[PDB]
Design a protein around this ligand. Structure first.
Ligand SMILES: [Zn+2]
Ligand SMILES: [Zn+2]
Lengths: 368, 368
C-alpha cells in the first residue's frame, strides 16, 4: 500500500465518500474514529464494530507511560495491540484544558497527575507522535477560545500558521516518519471568514496530506458551527480529506458531512456509554431511567451489534445502576457500533446518490 | 441429561475426578466456579476460559435487581446470558457480613445500600434461589465465627441441621425445582470432630445431592483448615460431590483436593485481578510493581489464555496503574483462565495416577 492516497469514489452536493489508503490499512470515508486504550474494549472488539482507524490522545500518553517508554516497547500499535492506522492529536488541546506558560516557542505546563513540569512545541509534538508511531500526525497549533475577539483570533491563527510550518519541517526532517506517516494541518480563525481564508491559504501553501477544521465544538452551538463550516470547508483543498476535530453528536456528523467533512472523532459514544446514554435511531436514551428496569428489548431495535443480539435494556440498566464494569463494556460497544453503522449508512447513501434523503429521514426519526 | 448424576472416573488416595451431569450441562470435577455478572467479563469469555459452572451471589441479587424481577424477566440464566449450570449460595453469609436480628425462624436485616429491611429464612432462601432459576441450590445455614467455643459451635451446628431439614422440605415442595435442580447441604461444627460427625450424620439422614464443608476459610489458617478437612471430608457420603465454600488460593485448592474436595469457589482471582495480583506457575505477582513497567513477557510464560497470547506485562501494568477498565478485564480473564488450567492439570493428573507428584511439583515451583 502507499504511504497515503485519498480517492473520492462518489459525491452528492458537498458530501463525498471514498477511501484513504495507508500502509497499515484502508480507511473508509466519511469515517468515525473512536478515541483511545479505547476505554472498556479490546482492540478486536473495536475492529468488530467497523472502525478502520482509532485516535490516540498524545497528552495522556506523554504523561503515562511516556512516549520514550512506548517507543522502547515497540510503539503504540504493538503496545496496545491495534495493528491498523492510528491518528494522534498534537497534545496541545488537553494542555490548555487539563494541565502553564505559553510563548512563541511552545508551552510549558505542570502535569495534572504529578505536578511534574513538561514542554510541548511544534518540534516536540511531532517527535512524540513519531515515538508513538502514529500513522496520521496532527500539526501543533494554538487554540482560540469561544468567544474570541477578532484581534485575538487573528493572533492565534497567525501563530498557528507559523507553528504549522514548523510542524511540517519537523515531520519532513525525520526520514522514517516522512516516508511512512501522513501530516494534517489545522485551519483556525474562529468564526471570521477572512481569517479562515487566510489560514486555508497558508496551510495549502505549506502543503499537508489532509486538513482539519479547528476551533469548532468549543461552545458555539450547532447553528453557528454549521454556518462556519458552510464557508470554511470550501476554502480547503478539495482533493484532500477534511477532518472536523471533536465532533460529535449523530446529527452534528450528518450535517457536517453535508458540508464536506470526511473524518470525525469524539469521546461522546465512549464517555456517554459509561454515563448511561445509549444512541438509538429514535434518539438517545438514558438506560439508568427506571422505565427500562423491565424492558426486554435491545438497546436499539435495528442495531446489528453483539450487545443488541444478546442482552436486554433491563440487564444493562441493572449493570449501570450497580456500577458494574460489564455495564460500561456493553454500553460502549453498542455506542461505537451505532456510530459505525451511521457512517456506513452515510457512505452508502452518498455512493447511491440518496444522501440528501437519508439526512432528512434520519433527522425526522431521531428527533421525533 | 438427568437432573443430577455424579460419576467418579478415577481416584488417587482421597482425590477424585469425575463429572456432574445436569440438565444444563456437564461439570468436570474437581471444578473451580467463578463468582458472579462475573465482574468485567462477558459470559462467552468466562466459558472460553474453561468454566463449566458459575456461582451466583443470592444476597446481592435479592437486593438489586430483586429475585421477583429476575423471575419476571425470565430467570438469571436468560438475564445475564449464561446458559450452563449456576450454583447459588443461600444469601446467609453476606447477611452476617455486609448488611440484624436472628432467631430460630431466620434473620431480618437492613440493606447496606438503602436501609430497607429484608428477611431470610430457609424457606425464603430456597424460594429466592427458585426465582433465580438456580441449578444447584444451597441449604440455608447459620454461620459459626472463628474462633468459636464448643457450646456456640454446637448451638449453631444444631440450628443449621434444623434449617437443613427445612431447606430440604421447602425445595421438595416445589415441583419445578425438585425435578430440575439439585440441593446441597452444608456441614458445620467448627474445628470440633464430634460436632462435624454429628453434622455429617444429620445431613446424610436428610439426604442431599452434594455436601459442602462449611465454616472454614474464616481466619483459621491453612494448617488448621487442612487438619479439619482431614477428618471432616471422610464423614460425608463418598458417592456425592464435596464442596469447599470460599476456597481459595491455588495451594489451598491442591491441598483440599488431596483431602477429597471436588468443588471450589472464591472471589480471589476476580478481586485480585482488579487489585493488580496475577497468578503464575511461579507464584503470584503484583503487576503494579515498577519492575514490570518495561517487561515485554506475558503475565505467565506457559499460560494459554488470550491475554497471555496478546498483551505484555508492561501494557497491563500501565492499564492497572491508570485505573483503566481494560486492565481489570485483562487481569480477570487471565486469573480465571489460570484457575481453570490448574483444575485441568489436577483432573488430568488424578486420571493418570500422578496427582501426588503433580502436587509436589506444583508447590515446589509455586513457592520457589
Ligand atoms: Zn447495539
Ligand atoms: Zn494468561
Amino acid at each position: 500500500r502507499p504511504r497515503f492516497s485519498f480517492s473520492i469514489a462518489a459525491r452528492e452536493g458537498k458530501a463525498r465518500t471514498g477511501t484513504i489508503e495507508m500502509k497499515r490499512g484502508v480507511i473508509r470515508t466519511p469515517a468515525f474514529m473512536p478515541v483511545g486504550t479505547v476505554k472498556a474494549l479490546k482492540p478486536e472488539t473495536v475492529r468488530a464494530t467497523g472502525a478502520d482507524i482509532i485516535l490516540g490522545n498524545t497528552y495522556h500518553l506523554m504523561l503515562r507511560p511516556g512516549a520514550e517508554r512506548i517507543a522502547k516497547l515497540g510503539g503504540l500499535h504493538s503496545f496496545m495491540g491495534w495493528d491498523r492506522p492510528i491518528l494522534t492529536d498534537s497534545g496541545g488541546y488537553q494542555v490548555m484544558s487539563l494541565s502553564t506558560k505559553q510563548s512563541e516557542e511552545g508551552v510549558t505546563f505542570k502535569s495534572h497527575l504529578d505536578g511534574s513540569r513538561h514542554m510541548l512545541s511544534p518540534e516536540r509534538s511531532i517527535e512524540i507522535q513519531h515515538l508513538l508511531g502514529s500513522d496520521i500526525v496532527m500539526a501543533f497549533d494554538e487554540c482560540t477560545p469561544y468567544p474570541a475577539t477578532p484581534s485575538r483570533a487573528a493572533s492565534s491563527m497567525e501563530r498557528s500558521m507559523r507553528w504549522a510550518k514548523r510542524s511540517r519541517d519537523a515531520f519532513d526532517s525525520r526520514k522514517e516518519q516522512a516516508e511512512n506517516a501522513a501530516l494534517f494541518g489545522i485551519q483556525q480563525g474562529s468564526v471570521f471568514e477572512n481569517l479562515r481564508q487566510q489560514s486555508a491559504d497558508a496551510l495549502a501553501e505549506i502543503g499537508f496530506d489532509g486538513y482539519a477544521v479547528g476551533g469548532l465544538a468549543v461552545g458555539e452551538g450547532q447553528d453557528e458551527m454549521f454556518r462556519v463550516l458552510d464557508f470554511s470547508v470550501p476554502m480547503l483543498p478539495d482533493d484532500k480529506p477534511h477532518y472536523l476535530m471533536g465532533v460529535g453528536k449523530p446529527d452534528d456528523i450528518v450535517g457536517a458531512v453535508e458540508r464536506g467533512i470526511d473524518m470525525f472523532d469524539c469521546v461522546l459514544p465512549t464517555r456517554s456509554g459509561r454515563n448511561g446514554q445509549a444512541f438509538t435511531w429514535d434518539g438517545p436514551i438514558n438506560i439508568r431511567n427506571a422505565r427500562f428496569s423491565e424492558d426486554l428489548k435491545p438497546l436499539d431495535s435495528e442495531c446489528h451489534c453483539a450487545v443488541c443480539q444478546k442482552w436486554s435494556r433491563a440487564y444493562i440498566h441493572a449493570l449501570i445502576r450497580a456500577g458494574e464494569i460489564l455495564g460500561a463494556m456493553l454500553m460502549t460497544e453498542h455506542n461505537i457500533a451505532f456510530y459505525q453503522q451511521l457512517m456506513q449508512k452515510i457512505r452508502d447513501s452518498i455512493s447511491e446518490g440518496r444522501f440528501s434523503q437519508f439526512a432528512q429521514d434520519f433527522r425526522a426519526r431521531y428527533f421525533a
